[PDB]
């Protein structure tokens, strides 16, 4: 279960390690005046329709198998 | 109760469907209602059919526009190898 939290907290972390992370901290201040993957996955309407059809097929198959 | 699909094909005249509208959308999903109105003088499209072939002779409210086409299609598919 905690593998997910480990992966997320290392995905959100900066690149440089703490010995030289002070460079990455200054860039955040400089960018202060101004998720394709790793968290989510954005898909079009055709892919959404195919996913919905697959899920309906899976749930009806599950109920049929349970009854049988 | 069982898996699998049955290729049921309906060849119905276009003039007897309860909603000539709500189906004009070309290559797009169109919702359809199975509710039957006895005073509408028409009939609803039967569900649980895999495909439909709606044949029209230009009239509305009368049959006879699909028997010859259905027989010709049966003759042509019978000769198929």
From Swiss-Prot, chain B:
Organism name: Mus musculus (Mouse)
Knockout mutant characteristics: Trpm3-deficient mice exhibit clear deficits in their avoidance to noxious heat. Trpm3-deficient mice display reduced hypersensitivity to thermal, but not to mechanical, stimuli in carrageen-induced inflammatory pain. In the chronic constriction injury (CCI) model of neuropathic pain, intraperitoneal injection of isosakuranetin or primidone do not reduced heat sensitivity in Trpm3-deficient mice.
Assembly and oligomerization: Homotetramer. Interacts with TRPM1; the interaction results in the formation of a heteromultimeric cation channel complex that are functionally different from the homomeric channels.
Protein name: Transient receptor potential cation channel subfamily M member 3
Function: Constitutively active, non-selective divalent cation-conducting channel that is permeable to Ca(2+), Mn(2+), and Mg(2+), with a high permeability for Ca(2+). However, can be enhanced by increasing temperature and by ligands, including the endogenous neurosteroid pregnenolone sulfate and sphingosine-1 and suppressed by intracellular Mg(2+). Implicated in a variety of cellular processes, including insulin/peptide secretion, vascular constriction and dilation, noxious heat sensing, inflammatory and spontaneous pain sensitivity.
Residues of the full protein shown: 241 to 321 of 1732
Membership in a protein family: Belongs to the transient receptor (TC 1.A.4) family. LTrpC subfamily. TRPM3 sub-subfamily.
Subcellular location: Cell membrane
Chain intervals for the UniProt region annotation (Calmodulin-binding): 60-81
């Amino acid at each position: 279960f905690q593998r997910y939290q480990l992966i997320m907290t290392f995905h959100e972390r900066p690149v440089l390690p703490p010995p030289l992370i002070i460079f990455s901290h200054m860039t955040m201040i400089f960018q202060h005046v101004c998720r394709d993957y790793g968290l989510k996955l954005f898909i079009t309407d055709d892919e959404l329709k195919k996913v919905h059809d697959f899920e309906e097929q899976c749930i009806e198959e599950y109920f049929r198998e349970k009854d049988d | 109760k069982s898996r699998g699909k049955i290729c049921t094909i309906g060849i119905a005249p276009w003039g007897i469907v309860e909603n000539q509208e709500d189906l004009i959308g070309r290559d797009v999903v169109r919702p359809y209602q199975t509710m039957s109105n006895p005073m509408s003088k028409l009939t609803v499209l039967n569900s649980m059919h895999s495909h439909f072939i709606l044949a029209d002779n230009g009239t509305t409210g009368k049959y006879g526009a699909e028997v010859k086409l259905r027989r010709q299609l049966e003759k042509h598919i019978s000769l198929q190898k």
